Symmetry: C2
Subunit: 90 residues, 2 copies
């Protein structure tokens, strides 16, 4: 049933990511989506779903750094580091 929970979380993430991408709905909404899905998958406790989340969060971090938002970058980097440490300890 853990696999079913991971599948539901990933389906929600995919649908929300697709809807956000075919729009212009700011970087903050995308970061909130990533953080929500990351916390859900951390309460589930499965790897191989947090590593792709980490890679996509690095993509978002690059996008934010190329822009002019210095307060969103610190939250993105803190989330990335925390998820990396949790993956290492998981």
């Amino acid at each position: 049933e853990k696999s079913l929970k991971v599948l539901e979380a990933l389906e929600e993430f995919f649908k929300e990511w697709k809807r956000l991408e075919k729009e212009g709905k700011s970087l903050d909404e995308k970061l909130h989506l990533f953080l929500r899905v990351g916390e859900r998958l951390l309460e589930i406790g499965d790897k191989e779903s947090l590593e792709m989340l980490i890679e996509l969060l690095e993509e978002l971090a690059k996008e934010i750094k190329k822009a002019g938002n210095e307060e969103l970058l610190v939250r993105a980097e803190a989330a990335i580091k925390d998820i990396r440490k949790h993956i290492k300890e998981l």
Copy 2:
């Protein structure tokens, strides 16, 4: 049905906060619980349930400041600022 989702989120928050206060857990599990509940309440559409979370997160940040962790206080402060801005815009 919005109120029912808010009630479910608050029920999960209360139960897990009771658990984490009972079994002497780390200061990171509490922050992860707060972030999870805050993101869920931000996603629905609720205020007047996000100000109590702001109060409790301010108390948790006060606890973190006098603990000895500096890379954990930045995440809490960033979350407080983002939730406060979203409350203002909501």
